[PDB]
Design a protein around this ligand. Structure first.
Ligand SMILES: CCCCSc1nc2c(N)ncnc2n1[C@@H]1O[C@H](COP(=O)(O)O)[C@@H](O)[C@H]1O
Ligand SMILES: CCCCSc1nc2c(N)ncnc2n1[C@@H]1O[C@H](COP(=O)(O)O)[C@@H](O)[C@H]1O
Ligand SMILES: [Ca+2]
Ligand SMILES: [Ca+2]
Ligand SMILES: [Zn+2]
Ligand SMILES: [Zn+2]
Ligand SMILES: [Zn+2]
Ligand SMILES: [Zn+2]
Lengths: 523, 523
């Protein structure tokens, strides 16, 4: 019995086709992804193959103005139009709190939404009961397939789920549900979830009875053969795990941003054992036409985005100096504003051990692409912010040793004076440079804002300590020559869209007035 | 023909009786003021004297939780109960914008509200037309008296009137209105207004046809004889100005906070010339009973204040360190929070020459009387803030030369180490002390945030420059040994209530996390 699994993950609000690097589409003949093109390919496959499941492994929420304006209603609408068969909850599905999940998505989706390791308490438990499920048994052809969901246990540190949800260890929560399905004579089991490739491999190894793992979160690209685009595979597709019980369990993921459709064919025997599997993600490039009806619907929904983009978000009473002559040479108030917004976006529910889990931010000055002039009655719109931050990136959370962060600050000024983009703007960090010293030895003081303290204050950076830092995805991936960040980081989770982080902060503050205050000094 | 003028000014929300120093009443047998006691005295005088006008010279708004909760409705209600005959607009009547004046007060008062030098434009001009007036002609006995109002031209820098009101020079606006009254055969003219004693004397000298000036704003105490309490007279009551035309024009004011009722008897001839005048403010002490009916009404209205005082204003995720061991010895995050709130409260509509008119704050650490613990789910209530700031003061705007501010910072540490209250918390100021130097020579660096700049940044304090600084009224009056501030300041305007400044900021921010960030350092 042959099953075709089509799967997406970490689509992150890329409803419209994108450029090759998942930023805004500019040259249509070279654009990729989007839901209209996905529809064409899914429909084609469903014409030809009898036993098809279309699955999403989470993180449809967050990533473009679509999510800012429609807040998940676009996810329900377009996933319903595609006829997804099931979705697992990702961390970003909690970005607008549990109510921002229930109302736009759980109540509107025409497919089951799954997570076995999220447990509710208090009145919420009654309010949400049955709106997401630990698993669903789905009819496929003349057979049935069980799908058991899971969501990163780190979600409370990455999103805004509130204090009435408990995120249990994935393997601990999954095993009893898989065991239950076995007792109900469901012998074909897919684990669909949102914890990252490393956890996916552990689930494949340790959760007895799982036949295939369909994952997400880590934006992992897997491929068998020559890759079709610029993404570099982390492993073959599928990635085969040898389980504790000796079975071969395929693990799949399909990058992010709707650029690829995962495609896995599995051959099962009559007892539900995987005999073999093979496939590859399908690049959704311009050789696949956008479905005209979906495209027309997208264009209709875009009108409200255009309208929103020119509305006042808030006001500034200061010039927002995002000039290169400032931001590539010294502390600039636009950089301070953006870092302050990054930290504010990452205020998460703490225990008593930390005032907040993260206090620190770095931002390459070359990422700041425009000033904003305060003389238009102080108004700031989304369009103004999109001129400052035009790359379509995210502000991500990483863990870095102090030694790595010192190397990054040396890199920031190693060729100072040439208006290069690597000069760092900061938050929660006070740095002093002495440019008369040799490159590599110019950082003479580096103090950081504590997190494990009830009163935030600055102390010297410690070379062995691990620090949480918010920074652009561009830097987390080693852009601007920051190879030490890519190579030495100890954890990396994708964050919110850059423009939206700043827009939310401005709207919360209403009137902003960022100063240059001595975060960066020169001896 | 004899007229008795009863007058109040700068009552500032002191609806309930107060202590001798106008803070919260503690020992009832020694408390003073309040509207119930005022009612008793006004009613008594009106039984005995045939020709009485009860006038208010502005600034009923702002000063206690009464204003925070009732937003001016309490002013209309209790002034109506007293049967005020007229009121001039003060600067604080604009604290909640023009709409916060129109709705609670202008539309509800049963007496004319006056200002001849405020001109409206745009749609506001039609919306407000006739709701305040330049003057009113009032029948008194068998005669008539004209009352012409005025309001500080500095109101745009002191309050929130918006950009559709123009505050004209007082003398320029008053003269044509007084001239008009003369043509209507109104020969007895009172100028009632809110610009300060110095401007009141200029109006008396220069506005031809004004017979008596009843003022406010400067909290000026005038008295003929031995003073009855602790206020020190600035001059006799009335203060006699010799006008340009040779007439003797009495000028009166009655301190602030409802502690005194001004009382002036004027003898007019048949042509409306003042033959003589005499009087004195009446101390509203415990020898005058509180009117039982007004007192019972006050007690009924107080219930909603009690309820409000325990409601959550916002949250903190950090411990708010208002301990003396911190705030009298080093930078403390409670001090930073309070100074940040002070600056935020003083954001006013600027021209293009300044991002804001004021950027700088000082706060004596001895004025910070409690920490606030973040472990009660982060909640902050008014009652918590009242423990931090229990003195009933205001955060005022002053102009100080840099040399004066340097002397103040030397005073801040002149006997450092004894846990004395004069140690300064700051905003918009970065100070470095070297305590090994002699007292008086311990300030080694003092940088301040610019105002006449589009991008706020820090520069050295200049000894000759004049700076605007927000600070407690206690310091503006020379408390804590800061005699240089009292003696050398170049301007002083009373600001908003201390607790309300902080409560408004917390409610705007929703979640606060003030840090210790290097505003104060020691070599
Ligand atoms: C191969 C792709 C590189 C594209 S560059 C670029 N991508 C991004 C991005 N995705 N997120 C943030 N900053 C970026 N920048 C910044 O742009 C500067 C160059 O700009 P310029 O030519 O004006 O000097 C660089 O030094 C960087 O700091
Ligand atoms: C004659 C009236 C003085 C009353 S004192 C006082 N009034 C106020 C006030 N009205 N606004 C602010 N701070 C005040 N303090 C501060 O209180 C400290 C003494 O407190 P302590 O006895 O705990 O050392 C002083 O060093 C001051 O900084
Ligand atoms: Ca099986
Ligand atoms: Ca006259
Ligand atoms: Zn994601
Ligand atoms: Zn994720
Ligand atoms: Zn006043
Ligand atoms: Zn005033």
């Amino acid at each position: 019995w042959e099953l075709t699994i089509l799967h997406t993950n970490d689509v992150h609000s890329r409803l419209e086709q994108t450029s090759e690097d998942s930023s805004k589409c500019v040259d249509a003949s070279r654009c990729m992804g989007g839901v209209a093109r996905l529809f064409t390919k899914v429909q084609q496959i469903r014409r030809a193959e009898p036993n098809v499941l279309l699955l999403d492994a989470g993180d449809q929420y967050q990533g473009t103005i679509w999510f800012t304006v429609y807040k998940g209603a676009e996810v329900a609408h377009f996933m319903n139009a595609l006829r997804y068969d099931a979705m697992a909850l990702g961390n970003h599905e909690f970005d607008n709190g549990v109510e921002g999940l229930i109302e736009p998505l759980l109540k509107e989706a025409k497919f089951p939404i799954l997570s076995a390791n999220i447990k509710a308490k208090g009145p919420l438990a009654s309010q949400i009961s049955g709106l997401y499920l630990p698993y669903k048994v789905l009819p496929v052809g003349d057979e049935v397939v069980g799908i058991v969901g899971y969501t990163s246990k780190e979600t409370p540190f990455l999103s805004n789920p509130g204090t009435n949800l408990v995120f249990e260890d994935e393997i601990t929560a999954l095993q009893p549900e898989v065991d239950k399905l076995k007792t109900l004579n469901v012998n074909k089991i897919i684990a669909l979830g949102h914890s990252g490739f490393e956890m996916d491999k552990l689930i494949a190894q340790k959760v007895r009875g799982v036949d295939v793992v369909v994952g997400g979160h880590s934006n992992t690209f897997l491929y068998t053969g020559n890759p079709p685009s610029k993404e570099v595979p982390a492993g073959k597709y599928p990635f085969i795990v040898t389980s504790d019980d000796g079975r071969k369990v395929p693990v799949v993921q399909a990058y992010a941003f709707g650029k690829y459709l995962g495609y896995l064919k599995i051959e099962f025997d009559e007892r539900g054992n995987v005999i073999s599997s093979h496939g590859n993600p399908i690049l959704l490039d311009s050789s696949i036409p956008e479905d005209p009806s979906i495209k027309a619907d997208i264009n209709k929904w875009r009108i409200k985005l255009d309208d929103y983009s020119t509305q006042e978000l808030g006001k500034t009473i200061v010039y927002l100096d995002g000039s290169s002559q400032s931001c590539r040479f010294r502390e600039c108030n636009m950089g301070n504003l953006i870092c302050d917004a990054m930290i504010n976006n990452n205020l998460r529910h703490t225990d008593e051990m930390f005032w907040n889990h993260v206090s620190m931010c770095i931002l390459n000055g070359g990422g700041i692409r425009s000033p904003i002039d305060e003389r238009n009655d102080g108004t700031i719109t989304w369009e103004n912010l999109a001129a400052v931050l035009p790359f379509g990136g995210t502000f991500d959370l990483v863990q870095l040793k102090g030694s790595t962060l010192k190397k990054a600050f040396e890199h920031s000024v190693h060729r100072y004076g040439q208006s290069t983009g690597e000069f760092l703007q900061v938050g929660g960090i006070h740095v002093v440079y002495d440019l008369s010293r040799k490159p590599g030895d110019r950082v003479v003081k580096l103090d950081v804002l504590c997190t494990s303290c009830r009163v935030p204050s600055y102390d010297p950076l410690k070379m062995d300590e691990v620090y949480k830092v918010i920074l652009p995805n561009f830097l987390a991936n080693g852009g601007d020559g920051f190879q030490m960040i890519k190579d030495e980081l100890l954890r990396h989770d994708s964050g919110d869209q850059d423009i939206n982080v700043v827009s939310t902060y401005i709207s919360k503050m209403k009137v902003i007035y960022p100063a240059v205050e001595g975060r960066i000094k020169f001896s």
